[PDB]
């Protein structure tokens, strides 16, 4: 009964309110063991679909479109992601100079020391896109390796269509069809799961708001507005603009990508929302050849919301220390935060961890007694900021897919 | 050459005798490194099939039957399992008061202390039925998560059959067919494996009897009879009765579920026997829609033999301590042992571990110096008792599937 | 553009030269972080294919040929592998007495002590060929377990073809076709990957030669010639001979198995080359029923090049110690080195580790201060020797497959 897009908004609005209230009275623990579980069941159900829906769609997608086309689509969507994320940091910086988060704040040092996670070599990360066992990739998460194999297999099935043989052309057809069976079936699942969305959505915000809502005060409130205001400007000033320029009606784009944006925001998992954001890509009629490759790739490479969040935070820490950053250091943030964004995982609260990487680049390590005491303040309202960070991450992926879809 | 059902009985009877004899002369180690290996090869071969045969059968099964039907089947078979297991504990208690195992026994304390394995929250166990990656489920055991996904995919394929599109209805057909190919192929395997059954069966009892046969004396003999007598009464007084009531000839039910019962008994793995017990379900002509869902689920939820074993043992320990249990404590065993049974894994010697959980509930922890010295006595003949525990576990799953099958 | 077989030879010859030169000037580290990566990308791409290409080909292969035929093929190819490997050790010994590697050498003791890796029981290794979860096998490497399941499934699909039912015979067809789709697609991939071969090949030798080329002097040179000369005699004196005897033109056999031999040599992974060596088996028109089963099995069981390498080395260590081995000890090497060869993994530098196993059997453990200081000399030029060891390993697998193919 009832529309689904309506039910979510109710769950979201009524959820955010049931949370803030329960938590203000200290029931933050009662909400965690009682309400949250439902929000988790929603997440689990979505993660469930990611592997099959991604793999099966791309084999059909890579088999669908031209091998050179897919290659062009790739060069375009990568150019887009880089230019978006780079603009998102600079949009965050301009929000961190506009507002002043942690301007006249002095913090209690020594409270908590943080541990630096040593990053692996770029080379190793790149060669690890090519998986040594496809079955293993699928078996345990691993979206990007799967992306690689799927496209390869996709293109392989195509070349088996042109073969002179009858028995080869038939077996290739059969494989493709069954794989497409899975694909089609997976999108049908996302509908039924989207039915439990309102209940899940209610719970998910009920938890976040009860756990970190009441901490959104003082300088922590100012940084929160700084991020959200910026994010808002990323949508209006970057998406709504690039969409108009390319001849896509921005308003009916928001209408079609509503379920994706809200799942993203609530769930906090850029990757966990992927089956919803992939459906929404089918909804506005984009070709499987394009969205099937862009959305899963961008789900990891493209994070505007995260890049921006890292911008405003690198400025929060700097202001809390009392020393300002140079004209050239702000430009050194832009370039590092992009790299950090790309790096950030499609999972909740993964941007905050990556934030450290962009903190060394300016000149304020995370081991520094006081820096670490300021970074703990941010970490305390991180799930509040994360919801924003994720929504903008996802929007950017649809936007990019759309723009690249229209040009072809 | 020769019939298979005949060969097993020979292997079983001649195996049990070759074992008892070899072991009485201290060759318990000679049997383990020489004879057992063959019994293991039989187990490995059966485990081999479980994943494919379960998954592929349920996708076809869930796709076969009505979504509401499958749902009704579920409510019925769950009601059945609970009422069986609850009756099985009370049947065990009445066997533990009838016989008195460890009545006037005083044990050498301090011999061995046992370590309590802290259980996870019920919530966590329930949300973990919904897998976050189907490929992962399959990849590493995980029967229940697979059950969930398979049904979901099954129902998804069905809704793709009714689609207006031609290319969708065809791809959905193709997937289903191939998946069914696997299913059909897996049952054919179980035949060939059942051919090695006699050799395996011979070895498997040869080991159990040589390793723990000679320990079946004294108070350990009395508890052994107590369990077996009870188990026997579970079959005659609960299955043979509930089968007559529902209009199923009990005798030709035992005739058809012979291979399942014997594999179960010998193997000691409720789960490892699953491909045999699934074939036997096909043998008596039950629909894939029903047995495909009941048998794998009940293979973990339903354990009458284990529930009973836990009943008679909670009384063995209590009598060895010298203090009797209250009228209300016996009722507190019924309710805990059911929960423990459900909990017990479809693997050999897993009931004994769970026994601890039902031991705390009455008031005699497993850390208590002497309790633990009595529980070590039971553990010493556990594989003897386990064979019984498993057979009755499995019978109950077929029985339930049968009864639910007849009503529809 | 350009032929592929020509490009490789250029990469190989020009690669070996760019390596030796760069390394002689100490750029061994510059080659490792700059050039090698490309050689790795080539390896990754090949490993990628192994699982799918092996599995899918054998299901179709086992389904293709007679169950008794496949069984005969097995007995023949096993007899062949054993007799080859046994002849390869004796051919190495005769090379180690012909040349005298480490005759008058006295080494600096105490430099490096090595750690013995305790081997598992033969029984455990044999029962572990039968996998307890096929999906797991595939999921993580595990070629032999996959081999077992694939054949079983293959034979199962066949028996489903003869069924009286229509819906069974169709579903069995569908499965087989799709699985064959994968198979066919995988061979098409190996072509495209073989296109990157020259670049990879260039880099791969560029690294090996820069890293261990300059160490190929003195007594280390003499043992190197001893191995290579022997290997050469294994090809001419064992393959070219057994091929003529069975009516196969040796020269156009080398022409067809060129890509396999060179990938093998460069890559150093007997297993990593398997998709190339499997294609080359298709190239000379052998049946999927035969090569699909022989090549992956022999890829682990059959290692002539490794067996020989172990022969000449067991003599190098013995001569460096100063005590000669008995007539009967040389015969005790033959029998142990075969077992060690079979044991050696289809991965780079795995023969050297196994060498230890055949070192205990004569009477000179690897823990012995000085033995271990001599074994470290060998380990230093091991990748040089490994390239030879691998090529001959692979050749032997094609040879055997060919000979068994002709007899049928
Ligand atoms: Na994203
Ligand atoms: Na990212
Ligand atoms: Na059971
Ligand atoms: Na259980
Ligand atoms: Na080999
Ligand atoms: Na080997």
Author numbering:
A (entry chain B), B (entry chain C), C (entry chain A): 9 to 416
Question: Which statements did the authors publish about this structure?
Answer:
A prokaryotic cousin of the ASCTs and the EAATs, the aspartate transporter GltPh from an archaeon Pyrococcus horikoshii, was first crystallised in 2004, revealing the structure of the SLC1 transporter family. GltPh is a Na+-dependent transporter that is selective for aspartate. Like the EAATs and ASCTs, GltPh is also coupled to the co-transport of three Na+ ions and contains an uncoupled anion conductance. It exists as a homotrimer with each protomer containing 8 transmembrane domains (TM1-8) and 2 hairpin loops (HP1, 2).
To investigate the structural basis for the altered substrate selectivity profile of GltPh-R397C, we crystallised this single cysteine mutant transporter in the presence of L-serine, L-cysteine and benzylcysteine. In the L-cysteine-bound GltPh-R397C structure, the side chain of the cysteine at position 397 is pointing away from the substrate-binding site, which results in an increase in the size of the available pocket. Cysteine binds in a similar position to aspartate in wild-type GltPh and HP2 is closed, but the space in the binding site created by the removal of Arg397 appears to be occupied by an extra non-protein density. We ruled out possibility that bound L-cysteine forms a disulphide bond with Cys397 as the thiols appear to be too far from each other and because similar extra density is observed in crystals of L-serine bound GltPh-R397C. To investigate this, we examined L-[35S]cysteine uptake into liposomes containing GltPh-R397C and observe similar levels of uptake of L-cysteine in the presence and absence of the reducing agent dithiothreitol. In contrast, there are no observed clashes between cysteine and closed HP2, supporting the finding that cysteine is a substrate of GltPh-R397C as HP2 is required to close down over the binding site for translocation to occur. In GltPh-R397C, L-serine and L-cysteine binding is associated with an apparent number of coupled Na+ ions ~ 1.5–1.8, whereas binding of L-aspartate to the wild-type GltPh appears to be coupled to ~ 2.9 Na+ ions. The decreased number of coupled ions in GltPh-R397C is either due to the loss of a Na+-binding site or to the diminished cooperativity of binding. The latter possibility seems more likely because the geometry of all three Na+ sites is preserved, at least in cysteine-bound GltPh-R397C, and it is unlikely that some of these sites are unoccupied.
